[PDB]
Amino acid sequence: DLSRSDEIQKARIQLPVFGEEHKIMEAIHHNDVVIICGETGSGKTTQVPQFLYEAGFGAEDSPDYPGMVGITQPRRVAAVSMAERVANELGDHGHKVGYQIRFDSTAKEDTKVKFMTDGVLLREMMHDFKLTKYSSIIIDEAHERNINTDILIGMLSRCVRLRAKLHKENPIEHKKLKLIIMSATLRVSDFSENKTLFPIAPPVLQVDARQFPVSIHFNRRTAFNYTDEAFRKTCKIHQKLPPGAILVFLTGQQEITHMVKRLRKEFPFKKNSKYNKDLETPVSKMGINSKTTDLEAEDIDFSVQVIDQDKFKSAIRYEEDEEEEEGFEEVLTEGQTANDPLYVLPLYSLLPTKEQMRVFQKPPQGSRLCIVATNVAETSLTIPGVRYVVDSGRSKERKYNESNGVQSFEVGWVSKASANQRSGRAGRTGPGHCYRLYSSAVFEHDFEQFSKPEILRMPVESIVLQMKSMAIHNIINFPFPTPPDRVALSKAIQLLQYLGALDNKEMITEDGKKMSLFPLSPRFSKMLLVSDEKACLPYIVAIVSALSVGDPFINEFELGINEISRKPNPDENMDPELKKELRSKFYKSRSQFSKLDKFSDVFRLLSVVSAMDYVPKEQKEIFMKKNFLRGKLMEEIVKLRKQLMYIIKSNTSKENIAVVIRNEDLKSDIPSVIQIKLLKQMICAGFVDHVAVRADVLFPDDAKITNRTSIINIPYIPVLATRTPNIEDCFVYIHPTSILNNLGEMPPKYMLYYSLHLGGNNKTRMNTLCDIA
Ligand SMILES: Nc1ncnc2c1ncn2[C@@H]1O[C@H](COP(=O)(O)OP(=O)(O)O)[C@@H](O)[C@H]1O
Ligand SMILES: [Mg+2]
């Protein structure tokens, strides 16, 4: 027999999924694949595994369902917390419940209900595709559309098909597999209507959760300093409004730690109270890297966007086209004071497990609970008693810049769907309030309706590399929920081959696996991997960071000081002396960063970035102004170098003991001559498919050229280019801003280019990196 406590079984009957047990189990008995949709707090994660367990799934001599019940989460916080909750709810059967969030954790013997991440199950499928240890797999939180979730759903479609075939043949020897996909929303047509996933559409069950009304309060304007605004709003809620918990939505650990410290200092418990160490978080993050667990966007610090208040405000100035703050008309109730202690706790994915469990316990009497969380608390779990939500409206998400191939992880607006999901957390126990730290205008105009599936926010070569690191062989025909185009997939496989991440039979190499460990686009990952020779790693880190952020050099044409037009075509129609003096100082400044190498634009980049570390704080602006630099880009490059250094150091160890890096660690020696030649080979490894040979070499005497041709007129041809019936439609040229223009000597024979550019219609121009010998 199974025996739960009175508290437990009475909590369960309130949950809307509990009431639909009948329809759910009926569908599961009649169908191998079932989709269940229900809002957060419905009881999906806690109750469906219990339904299966009570039905005999995993029972030690079940004739049809002896395998475990596996349930995946895209979020490891949810995996662990919801495992602990289900173990509690199973009473004297709770020992059957375990979890696994690390690759090399080996789970308990008697575990029959197993919570794990996405990536854990993907890895188990490498050793047993059929997942024979499992009677049922629940893919949870699918509406988040993380890349591993999409991949797992495709993999499981094949697995369930195969298990059904084998079970049809011999049911004593091969058991069926029940696949259940669970979603917070109805947006499941990429699963339910996808015929390559499910030839026969699975049933879609809807659970009708009862959410109390939540009053939505927009701020009048949208503050740039959202952490200060959230602190301010949280204090006002706490001091004026009746009992109930506060959930604050920030974007990452650093912000959360700082905000929790401010709140504890503002509303402490009495001096040397026991509670002022139940709140202590002596370890800000667990030792974690990509070798042991699947990094989530939230965990990765690699941001390339300039933060800038002026740019922010001008981007949203339409809100200035149209008195008290709304949502503060309720008052304190008896036994409350404006200065009650705040039982404030952090909640983010890097948080140690024992600390992350504190958020479900009741606050001590006479205090108010405040959870400062990332969007882990948006749909993946529920904090009891939340009456007030404070929404920064933002999150850290993966982004892919199509124009330059840079993958990064950036703070930006969430979708409207996500904002509404955040608000809803204030409506689980009773009517509540959500305080959005942004205007109704900004919400309307700049919050996208729906967030893009992560597969659409990735370099396709990253998608392919991840699947290949999971030993998924057939990429082209893989049943994606949202498939990339076959052409892009083929090109991505070929790129990974040029990078040596896939071999000639399209299988991952050892260097491929190492690259798959990095959160960067594979060209950059490759350059960092081959870089640990002759103390060259820091130079490559500087170069990758500069390329990721962008060109900090303001050029003559942007300064409006060019003597000759950018383009030679003769179309369209104080200041002079000053312009000539500006040109003088500009070419001097440029030359000052061109001393490491005479042919290589990438090394003038390295040069400014290196010089930047010797310019003390009070010189930055003078430095910037004197050198026509984009100071915000330079500062961002400093920050990114430090982030990337942390990423590498965290990867060297198995357990992360990487130390905070300080600005003084970036001080570089200027590279030696052989160091420079080597850097050129490393960069070339990242861009092997981008070499351009002077047309006069491949074809001498068959094409025009003269003694005094402008350098910018000297034709190059990318070796991998598609020769056309009329050839010259395919040549490319050196840009007039490059270092090469100051040669006079003839330009190199083999040049390495970052990319080619066609806007600016004279001719296709090269964005040059360096020469190849
Ligand atoms: N320690 C706990 N962990 C998780 N949920 C808890 C805990 N204690 C109580 N609960 C309650 O259990 C319910 C869990 O619902 P859940 O299964 O997470 O729904 P869904 O997965 O559909 O969002 C919540 O309403 C929450 O209030
Ligand atoms: Mg859930």
UniProtKB/Swiss-Prot annotation:
Note: Present with 2000 molecules/cell in log phase SD medium.
Keyword Phosphoprotein listed: yes
The keyword Ribonucleoprotein is annotated on this UniProt entry: yes
Catalyzed reactions: ATP + H2O = ADP + phosphate + H(+)
One Gene Ontology term, aspect cellular component: nucleoplasm
Protein name: Probable ATP-dependent RNA helicase DHR1
EC identifiers of the protein: 3.6.4.13
Coiled coil (residue ranges): none
Gene: ECM16
Binding-site residues for ATP, renumbered to this chain: G38, E39, T40, G41, S42, G43, K44, T45
Motif DEAH box mapped to chain: 140-143
Subcellular location: Nucleus, Nucleolus
Annotated spans, Disordered: 317-333
GO MF, any single term: RNA helicase activity
Annotated function: Probable ATP-binding RNA helicase. Required for 18S rRNA synthesis. May play a role in restructuring of the pre-rRNA.
Domain Helicase C-terminal, residue spans: 299-471
Homology family: Belongs to the DEAD box helicase family. DEAH subfamily.
EC class name: hydrolase
Subunit structure: Interacts with snoRNA U3. Component of the ribosomal small subunit (SSU) processome composed of at least 40 protein subunits and snoRNA U3.
Alphabetic keyword roster: ATP-binding, Helicase, Hydrolase, Nucleotide-binding, Nucleus, Phosphoprotein, Ribonucleoprotein, Ribosome biogenesis, RNA-binding, rRNA processing
GO biological process: maturation of SSU-rRNA; maturation of SSU-rRNA from tricistronic rRNA transcript (SSU-rRNA, 5.8S rRNA, LSU-rRNA); ribosome biogenesis
Helicase ATP-binding domain location: 25-204
